[PDB]
Design a protein around this ligand. Structure first.
Ligand SMILES: *[C@@H]1O[C@H](CO)[C@@H](O[C@@H]2O[C@H](CO)[C@@H](O[C@@H]3O[C@H](CO)[C@@H](O)[C@H](O[C@@H]4O[C@H](CO)[C@@H](O)[C@H](O)[C@@H]4O)[C@@H]3O)[C@H](O)[C@H]2NC(C)=O)[C@H](O)[C@H]1NC(C)=O
Ligand SMILES: *[C@@H]1O[C@H](CO)[C@@H](O[C@@H]2O[C@H](CO)[C@@H](O)[C@H](O)[C@H]2NC(C)=O)[C@H](O)[C@H]1NC(C)=O
Ligand SMILES: O=S1(=O)NCN(C2CC2)c2ccc(F)cc21
Ligand SMILES: O=S1(=O)NCN(C2CC2)c2ccc(F)cc21
Ligand code: NA
Lengths: 295, 152, 51, 51
């Protein structure tokens, strides 16, 4: 159902209903649509419009599914309606074929969550942090309204949402539906070498690792100049590029289309049987209408 | 056969033998489908169907290949089966064509390696060099960004 | 971010104030003052970018 | 084809995608620390931008 928006799925079906009603109207007072339904004998004065209310939906649906009814409109004005409804039908079906081939070769997979604000509402996706860590510390002392709601869940749930160590929580994202809160540059080491983990959102906190010196030392100042030497020359950046980068995993190259199984089309077998059961109820429905008419 | 899984090819063929055998039930059961074959002669007792057991197979097959047939059911409950089976068939064809246009637009878009940079990225391809040769000597002293990664 | 710089409160070389301000800025960080201050000043209008 | 090209393409989202497409005009402050960084840069994606 994806490659057409459900706006179009409704506007098609109203257009199938609307033109089928105009087919009923034009057929009546068009005199050339009143033919001779008795062809084997010349001039028996019987007259019939075969474009009834039932068959006009049968012409619109039979044309929408590209197969055509047995009606084949006959004068000029039901012919213009039928033909312009025909050229409507190709442009739809040749769009739905065209647009579906776009989805089957350019796959844009998008996550249900895109920031921590999306985690505030999705209770189906659970939170997670290391027990008694600085990440857990930040939400407990927080004041921002998102993080309060994010803490109030994680406070009022434990052993299902709170991990003991981050290596255990890596398994919990990997196994369960679990969104894990941890440090930033720990993630880019994990993400780079585990290519079905991703980093959604951005930096929540903003802190830094610093060279530890004892309380009062001359080595605090000289290292501070020396740290800015590696960064402005660029040596500080290239060390990051060699210790966090790993395999790389370029699955951005689109693979073969992974031939459609029951997880992909799927719902047509449901709507087929949904048409099968509904027709039997009408089959016993109009059977009582005839037995009452016969009685 | 490649753009669909073979489970689908079994299930479509079972839907052909299913929906045709359901419409044959509804054609004998619904009163409207029992019609007079002679508007040329307004008779009685010649009231018949055209949907036999072989004909109902022929409608499901003939609608499967998007060309229709010569049957075109008249009764409303038979027309509900004719409505959904047609919407069933456009989804199969326009997922056949779109997926067959996907195997042929991926395989044509891809290319074998023709540079070291295309060899730099794809870590599936195992490299190779002489242990202690001038080749791996060059990748020590190389300052090209595409080559120290190969040296990495 | 390509580069990674940082705005620092300027002190003359060897002031005793250089260390208190480092203890002063790092206090406001732990009670989240600056981020609300950043959101007080960079936020602006609605700016319909929802889009 | 119009719907498999337009879906396949994407706007720029990195400097490397900005490095290649010479249709997009760049921009920097004349005598700023930004263009100062692209002088001293040893990254292959940036001296080309400096080029
Ligand atoms: C494509 O992406 C999918 C995301 O929807 C992902 O689906 C997850 O699949 C994993 C397993 O493949 C599910 O995680 C566990 O499933 C195993 C199955 O044994 C269980 O460990 C566990 O279920 C329960 O846990 C008990 C032991 O852990 C077990 O004894 C119980 O009987 C019970 O089964 C987890 O459920 C995970 O739920 C899926 N995520 C979802 C549904 O969101 C796919 O793996 C991924 N495909 C590939 C190829 O990567
Ligand atoms: C991606 O996650 C999967 C879990 O589905 C990890 O295990 C792989 O599972 C798939 C499906 O059975 C198979 O390809 C192999 O069993 C596993 N693939 C391997 C070991 O490469 C997998 O380790 C994860 N891969 C990455 C790159 O993160
Ligand atoms: O703890 S710091 O040394 N000073 C406080 N912060 C600030 C967000 C301003 C940051 C931000 C990023 C860092 F890497 C370090 C620090
Ligand atoms: O001038 S610093 O205190 N040290 C140098 N850098 C680097 C992280 C490399 C940064 C980066 C962001 C800052 F806010 C401060 C600094
Ligand atoms: Na046709």
């Amino acid at each position: 159902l994806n490659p057409l928006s459900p706006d179009i799925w409704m506007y098609v079906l109203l257009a199938c209903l609307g033109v089928s009603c105009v087919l009923f109207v034009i057929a009546r007072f068009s005199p050339y649509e009143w033919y001779n339904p008795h062809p084997c004998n010349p001039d028996s004065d019987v007259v019939e419009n075969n474009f009834t209310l039932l068959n006009s939906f049968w012409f619109g649906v039979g044309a929408l599914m590209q197969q055509g009814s047995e009606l084949m409109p006959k004068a000029l004005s039901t012919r213009i309606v039928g033909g312009i409804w025909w050229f409507f039908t190709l442009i739809i079906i040749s769009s739905y074929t065209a647009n579906l081939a776009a989805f089957l070769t350019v796959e844009r997979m998008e996550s249900p969550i895109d920031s921590a604000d999306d985690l505030a509402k999705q209770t189906k996706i659970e939170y997670g942090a290391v027990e008694d860590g600085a990440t857990m510390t930040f939400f407990k002392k927080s004041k921002i309204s998102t993080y309060d709601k994010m803490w109030a869940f994680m406070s009022s749930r434990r052993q299902s949402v709170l991990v003991k160590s981050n290596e255990e929580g890596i398994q919990r994202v990997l196994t369960s539906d679990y969104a894990f809160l941890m440090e930033s540059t720990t993630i880019e080491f994990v993400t780079q070498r585990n290519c079905n983990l991703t980093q959604i959102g951005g930096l929540i906190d903003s802190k830094g690792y610093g060279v530890g010196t004892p309380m009062g030392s001359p080595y605090r100042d000289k290292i501070t100049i020396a740290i800015l030497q590696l960064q402005e020359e660029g040596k500080l950046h290239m060390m990051k590029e060699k210790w966090w980068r790993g395999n790389g995993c370029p699955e951005e190259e689109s693979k073969e289309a992974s031939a459609l199984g029951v997880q992909n089309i799927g719902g047509i077998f449901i709507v087929l049987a949904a048409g099968l059961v509904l027709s039997v109820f009408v089959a016993v429905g109009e059977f009582l209408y005839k037995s009452k008419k016969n009685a």
